[PDB]
Amino acid sequence: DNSLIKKELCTEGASVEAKKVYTYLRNCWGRKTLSSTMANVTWNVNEAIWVNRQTGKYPAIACFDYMNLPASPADWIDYNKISVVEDWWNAGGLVAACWHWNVPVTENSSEYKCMISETDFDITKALQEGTRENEIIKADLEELAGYLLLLKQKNIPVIWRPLHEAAGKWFWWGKDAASYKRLWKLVYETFKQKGLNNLIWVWTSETNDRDWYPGDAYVDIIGRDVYHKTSAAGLATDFDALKKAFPDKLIALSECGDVATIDKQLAAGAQWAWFMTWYDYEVTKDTTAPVFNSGQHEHADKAWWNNAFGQPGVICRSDLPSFKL
């Protein structure tokens, strides 16, 4: 029974494809779990290709990262070149994106980071009109809205997960809950101003952090990021806690590495809407290097993925229905 899960996206006039994707996810709730991989760093499906070469199947969802706004467009990274994203969608896969929001390490720096230990960027100043920090984030949102509009123009919906792990307090946007929620609302309202109706909004919870929750008007799905947790009972306890906290929303395992196998998690009752393994930089950065074939992987290796795909409840790319017209 999925009747508790809200039926409509929080976005007024959401795109036809985004509604189809959301409806399918809602229909899968409690029955199936989608598989997902992260890009190697930002803008490729190298980890999806790796999983196929390890297992014979592709993950359902491929995720991309808009982290490289400061350098793009550039010869080595150009978010205007959306062919990698179109190709994956046109091969029948679902598209996701997150955003490590990189900001100057200090005033006038040419180096950009997101962790609080590596940048003194102040969110309080970023929300004050016209400060250096405010003009920076407004210019980033303006550039990113342009990139996402290229996908909306192509009728590609995006499972969109910005500003993640806020209550872990290790990113610059996790200074305090009140400014965090103002920043989320600013992103949401900016993207609405630019007509981005193709986004399904995923808010990443640290559990027990309702004061950081941006609110029902700005969130569609709840995400949870978990590393180094090999007790399946522990993961199911987290799953059930999030379910009690947000009874009307899908709950996903939006990042994971070094976690119990999916069969153990499902047996324990953790029925995530999807799981996405993080990328292993050295293994998948080059699909033609010998390391690409080893099967070893810092977050989920060949055995883990072969176990996941051997489960009835797990959806691979070929199991998905069509989300086009």
Ligand X SMILES: OC[C@H]1O[C@H](OC[C@H]2O[C@@H](O[C@H]3[C@H](O)[C@H](O)[C@H](O[C@H]4[C@H](O)[C@H](O)[C@H](O)O[C@@H]4CO)O[C@@H]3CO)[C@@H](O)[C@@H](O)[C@@H]2O[C@@H]2O[C@H](CO)[C@@H](O)[C@H](O)[C@@H]2O)[C@H](O)[C@@H](O)[C@H]1O
User: Distance between CA atoms of 105 and 247, rounded to whole angstroms?
Assistant: 39
DSSP per-residue codes, 17-46 = HHHHHHHHHHHHTTT-EEEEEE-SSSS--H
Question: Between 216 and 286, whose beta carbon lies closer to ligand X?
Answer: 286
DSSP per-residue codes, 102-114 = -EESSTT-S-EE-
Contact partner at residue 57 from Ca ion, ligand X, Cl ion, none, CB < 5 to 8 Å by partner kind: Cl ion
152 binds Cl ion per the rule CB under 5 A: no
Q: Provide the minimum distance between the beta carbon of 324 and ligand X in the complex, in angstroms, as a whole number.
A: 30
- Footprint of ligand X (CB under 6 A): 41, 70-71, 76, 100, 102, 111-113, 281
**Catalytic pick among 111, 165, 189, 206:** 165
293 binds Cl ion per the rule CB under 5 A: no
Contact partner at residue 111 from Cl ion, Ca ion, ligand X, none, CB < 5 to 8 Å by partner kind: ligand X
Strand ranges in the chain using DSSP code E only, listed in sequence order:
33-38, 61-65, 94-99, 103-104, 112-113, 158-162, 199-205, 221-229, 251-259, 274-277, 314-315
The only residue of 216, 231, 318, 324 in contact with Cl ion, by rule CB under 5 A: 318
Question: Between 28 and 69, whose beta carbon lies closer to Ca ion?
Answer: 69
- Buried-exposed string 116-128: b where 16+ CB fall within 10 A, e elsewhere: beebebbbeebbe
- Footprint of Ca ion (CB under 5 A): 69, 72
Q: Which two tokens stand for residue 195?
A: 């007509």
Q: Which two tokens stand for residue 33?
A: 């779990």
218 binds Cl ion per the rule CB under 5 A: no
**Catalytic pick among 129, 206, 255, 298:** 255
Question: Between 71 and 320, whose beta carbon lies closer to ligand X?
Answer: 71
Q: Provide the minimum distance between the beta carbon of 93 and Cl ion in the complex, in angstroms, as a whole number.
A: 9
Question: Between 206 and 240, whose beta carbon lies closer to ligand X?
Answer: 206
Nearest partner of 205 among 194, 219, 190, judged by Cα: 219
Q: Say if residues 40 and 15 touch (Cβ distance below 8 Å).
A: no
86 given a catalytic annotation: no
Question: Between 70 and 92, whose beta carbon lies closer to ligand X?
Answer: 70
- Interactions with Cl ion, residue window 224-263 (CB under 5 A): none
Other residues' Cβ atoms within 10 Å of the Cβ of residue 230: 11
Q: Say if residues 266 and 296 touch (Cβ distance below 8 Å).
A: no
111 given a catalytic annotation: no
The only residue of 58, 203, 218, 279 in contact with Cl ion, by rule CB under 5 A: 58
Binding site for Cl ion (CB under 5 A): 57-58, 316-318
Q: Could you give the residue numbers annotated as active site? A: 165, 255
